[PDB]
């Protein structure tokens, strides 16, 4: 495409335009990133440091940083994995058809075999947390040497699910009744376009001119701020 | 038939078309008549 957009120009954020709306006129407003979801995965500082020594005391982690840079292997992860492993092995544990079907169910639950890395749960030479202890695997055949059973490694799929559940974890009265209220709320376009990025418009503008617009803003916004503030201060001085 | 019947209704055919039906104002047919 080329030239200016001919037709209806809507904000890419999905917010309406009007006299008392976030936007005064029609436009794309792709530079206005405050109207889209940008997680804060870094730190934040303050304008002033009251302390007499520059210790970096104002610097602090952002709330979204704890979800941006997670840590896996925590004790609650371990506990959740243990409970879920018990529940997930319930089927093979309570199967009473035969060794063939038991192995089939075990392979379905945790694929493994030659050339594969499994948990070794069903292997005869691996220790399991049974409720009723029994022979590891009558008296005639056994292991005359010590040969302790090796430990069982985790189920990678289930452990990954448990670890990733954190990203999906979500954190009388003045009796005044609302009559101008909505029964079923409302679902505008902005609620979607704020966070679902793939629905928004891809710009045809040159990155050179995008950068130029940023540079112009960095120099012109303070002047407009001071223009309106000076209007207000002059009016107050005149009133005084 | 749309534009054709419109011409019939507004009367252009009544003037410009021969009619073996004759009439005292319409054009007549001097040849033996057959369906066309």
């Amino acid at each position: 495409p080329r030239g200016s957009h001919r037709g209806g120009v809507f904000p890419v954020s999905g917010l309406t335009w009007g006299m008392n709306r976030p936007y005064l006129k029609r436009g794309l407003y792709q530079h206005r990133r405050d109207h889209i979801f940008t997680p804060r995965w870094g730190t934040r500082t303050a304008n002033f440091n009251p302390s007499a020594l520059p210790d970096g005391s104002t610097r602090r982690w952002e709330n979204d940083a704890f979800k941006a840079w997670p840590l896996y292997g925590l004790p609650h992860h371990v506990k959740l994995y243990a409970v879920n492993e018990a529940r997930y092995l319930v089927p093979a544990a309570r199967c009473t058809a035969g060794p063939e079907i038991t192995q089939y169910i075990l392979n379905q639950l945790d694929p493994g075999g030659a050339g594969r890395n499994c948990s070794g749960i069903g292997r005869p030479d691996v220790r399991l947390p049974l409720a009723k202890p029994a022979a590891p695997s009558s008296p005639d055949v056994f292991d005359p040497f010590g040969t302790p059973l090796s430990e069982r490694s985790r189920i990678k799929r289930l452990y990954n699910l448990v670890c990733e559940a954190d990203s999906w974890r979500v954190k009388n009265a003045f009796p005044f009744v609302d009559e101008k209220a909505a029964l079923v709320r409302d679902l505008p376009l902005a609620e979607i376009l704020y966070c679902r990025h793939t629905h928004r418009l891809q710009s045809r503008r040159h990155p050179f001119w995008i950068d130029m617009g940023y540079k112009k803003r960095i120099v012109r916004i303070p002047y407009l701020y001071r223009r309106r503030v000076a209007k207000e201060e002059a009016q107050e001085r005149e009133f005084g | 038939c749309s534009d054709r019947k419109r011409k019939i209704l507004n009367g252009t055919e009544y003037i410009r078309r021969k009619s073996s039906h004759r009439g005292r104002i319409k054009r007549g047919s001097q040849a033996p008549a057959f369906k066309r």
Binding site: - | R6, L9, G11
Partner: protein
Amino acid sequence: ISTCRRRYFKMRKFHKKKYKKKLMRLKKIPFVERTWKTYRETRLYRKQLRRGLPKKGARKLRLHRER
């Protein structure tokens, strides 16, 4: 068609017939005494600058091409 719409055609047909009847009486036949092109003529050929020939090819004209 409806009666209201029929009246327009009624009037125009009647006017035609009446104006022909008016001349029916006479016997002496009256005597009645273009660089620009029409739109249908203009639509035959394409004016886009191809390789040289103004109107000497199917790609130059708008005739039904056998393909």
